Amino acid sequence: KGEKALKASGLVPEHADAFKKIARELNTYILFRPVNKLATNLIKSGVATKGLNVHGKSSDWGPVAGYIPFDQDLSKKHGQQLAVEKGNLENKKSITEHEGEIGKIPLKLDHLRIEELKENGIILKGKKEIDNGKKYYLLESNNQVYEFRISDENNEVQYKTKEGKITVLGEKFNWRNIEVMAKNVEGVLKPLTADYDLFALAPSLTEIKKQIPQKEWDKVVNTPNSLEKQKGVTNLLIKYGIERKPDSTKGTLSNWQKQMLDRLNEAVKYTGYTGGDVVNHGTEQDNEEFPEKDNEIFIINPEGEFILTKNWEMTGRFIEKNITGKDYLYYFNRKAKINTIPTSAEFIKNLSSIRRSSNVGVYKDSGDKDEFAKKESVKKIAGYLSDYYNSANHIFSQEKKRKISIFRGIQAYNEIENVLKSKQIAPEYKNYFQYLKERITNQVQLLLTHQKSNIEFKLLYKQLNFTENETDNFEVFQKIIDEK
């Protein structure tokens, strides 16, 4: 709500205030994926924020935490058996995919970081063994499996394991350094910490008229059919801005929204960051390996209020109060599910993720009739789910938003129940369809009990028998739900 995030944030304040000025400037919702201090210390010292090259994120241990490893214990994969070699192959494939940018370079850190982390209580300067032509500045940590080995002048950490003990990886070495990769900014060696991130971008409800050159808004608004008016608003935004473009440098947004990401980049160009592109990959769901559920989401609004949520239940609560539930915009992360169900890109990942554990799916890489009737059905599911995940409906009142959203769920539920009414359905795909079916039922019905319409879902489903359209059978849905 302000300062309660500033005291337990782990981020830097100058980026926050220079985001506050652009929040007042072009009125967008800069939603944060907050990271800890162990990367933004060296970010404020001026070392690079990596893109999607290696996925060694903010580790919590050491003055070289946040920094990318070669021996991957210096990341979240700390204490794992086969994941460390998988990350070693990840950096050996990041050199072969992001070549020209990625090298195998020694480090460059500022030496005040060790005295910064004598006071966070992790590292204990203990025994000394003589090497490298000096009294070597050794220090152990709260773990002793791998130490750090720094001289007071050089910017290389030439670590070793203790040869009196054994390792956990299965291999041994001499005092061999963590060779780090880099965002080599035209030959300048810049190693990589866990990057400065985002959670979402969302302008105001009328700044799309200040984002779209509004001479298409000049021809969209004047139209006589109100349902077709909202559909002429919405289909234009599907053909303009839903179609995200991914890369390996900046993240996953559209054209105007990466045009706002360069202003979110100019927020740090004048205040202590020299690594260039500061927004590089966003939230936990902007990660392309597996999702994570974060419990602290730092909302600054178009006013710039330094608000943090409490947990994910309260995060969805605040989202449905103000972020979507007020006159605002929700450009989002594309058996007890209370408020939410996952998304359609999550549905496509879930779709192509489970037909390899079991060889048979009900539709596969084939050429038959019912499998591609099912493909057209599931394309209709994706379209109906894109228009159910739609906060472009507050040009009308919130009752119209709920009406549009659940008519989308009705049309999707019709085909979801219909494709189960088929031949022999594989039980994984059968229970996956029912797994989505019970929750889409409860998502409509929890809306309806949070509405004032009171009908059961099944009666509302059986009174509507739409042929193909949402141009006539929305009027019968209207005349059922209207007058209260």
Curated annotation (Swiss-Prot):
<keyword id="KW-0479">Metal-binding</keyword>
<dbReference type="GO" id="GO:1902494">
    <property type="term" value="C:catalytic complex"/>
</dbReference>
<feature type="region of interest" description="Interaction with calmodulin">
    <location>
        <begin position="327"/>
        <end position="484"/>
    </location>
</feature>
<feature type="active site" description="Proton acceptor">
    <location>
        <position position="55"/>
    </location>
</feature>
<feature type="binding site">
    <location>
        <position position="252"/>
    </location>
    <ligand>
        <name>3',5'-cyclic AMP</name>
    </ligand>
</feature>
<feature type="region of interest" description="Catalytic CB">
    <location>
        <begin position="54"/>
        <end position="193"/>
    </location>
</feature>
<keyword id="KW-0800">Toxin</keyword>
<keyword id="KW-0115">cAMP biosynthesis</keyword>
<dbReference type="GO" id="GO:0141042">
    <property type="term" value="P:symbiont-mediated cAMP intoxication of host cell"/>
</dbReference>
<keyword id="KW-0964">Secreted</keyword>
<keyword id="KW-0112">Calmodulin-binding</keyword>
<keyword id="KW-1035">Host cytoplasm</keyword>
<dbReference type="GO" id="GO:0008237">
    <property type="term" value="F:metallopeptidase activity"/>
</dbReference>
<dbReference type="GO" id="GO:0044164">
    <property type="term" value="C:host cell cytosol"/>
</dbReference>
<dbReference type="GO" id="GO:0010856">
    <property type="term" value="F:adenylate cyclase activator activity"/>
</dbReference>
<keyword id="KW-0614">Plasmid</keyword>
<feature type="binding site">
    <location>
        <begin position="281"/>
        <end position="283"/>
    </location>
    <ligand>
        <name>3',5'-cyclic AMP</name>
    </ligand>
</feature>
<dbReference type="GO" id="GO:0005576">
    <property type="term" value="C:extracellular region"/>
</dbReference>
<keyword id="KW-0460">Magnesium</keyword>
<dbReference type="GO" id="GO:0008294">
    <property type="term" value="F:calcium- and calmodulin-responsive adenylate cyclase activity"/>
</dbReference>
<dbReference type="GO" id="GO:0005516">
    <property type="term" value="F:calmodulin binding"/>
</dbReference>
<comment type="subunit">
    <text>Interacts (via ATLF domain) with the cleaved form of protective antigen (PA-63) anthrax toxin; interaction is required for EF translocation into the host cytoplasm.</text>
</comment>
<feature type="region of interest" description="Catalytic CA2">
    <location>
        <begin position="194"/>
        <end position="326"/>
    </location>
</feature>
<keyword id="KW-0843">Virulence</keyword>
<keyword id="KW-0732">Signal</keyword>
<comment type="similarity">
    <text>Belongs to the adenylyl cyclase class-2 family.</text>
</comment>
<feature type="binding site">
    <location>
        <position position="197"/>
    </location>
    <ligand>
        <name>Mg(2+)</name>
    </ligand>
</feature>
<keyword id="KW-0067">ATP-binding</keyword>
<comment type="function">
    <text>Edema factor (EF), which constitutes one of the three proteins composing the anthrax toxin, causes edema in the host. Acts as a calmodulin-dependent adenylyl cyclase by converting ATP to cAMP, leading to dramatic elevation of intracellular cAMP levels in the host, thereby causing edema. EF is not toxic by itself and only acts as an edema factor when associated with protective antigen (PA) to form the edema toxin (EdTx). Required for the survival of germinated spores within macrophages at the early stages of infection.</text>
</comment>
<dbReference type="GO" id="GO:0006171">
    <property type="term" value="P:cAMP biosynthetic process"/>
</dbReference>
<feature type="binding site">
    <location>
        <position position="195"/>
    </location>
    <ligand>
        <name>Mg(2+)</name>
    </ligand>
</feature>
<dbReference type="GO" id="GO:0004016">
    <property type="term" value="F:adenylate cyclase activity"/>
</dbReference>
<keyword id="KW-0547">Nucleotide-binding</keyword>
<feature type="binding site">
    <location>
        <position position="281"/>
    </location>
    <ligand>
        <name>Mg(2+)</name>
    </ligand>
</feature>
<dbReference type="GO" id="GO:0052027">
    <property type="term" value="P:symbiont-mediated perturbation of host signal transduction pathway"/>
</dbReference>
<protein>
    <recommendedName>
        <fullName>Calmodulin-sensitive adenylate cyclase</fullName>
        <ecNumber>4.6.1.1</ecNumber>
    </recommendedName>
</protein>
<keyword id="KW-0106">Calcium</keyword>
<dbReference type="GO" id="GO:0005524">
    <property type="term" value="F:ATP binding"/>
</dbReference>
<dbReference type="GO" id="GO:0036094">
    <property type="term" value="F:small molecule binding"/>
</dbReference>
<feature type="region of interest" description="Catalytic CA1">
    <location>
        <begin position="1"/>
        <end position="53"/>
    </location>
</feature>
<keyword id="KW-0456">Lyase</keyword>
<dbReference type="GO" id="GO:0046872">
    <property type="term" value="F:metal ion binding"/>
</dbReference>
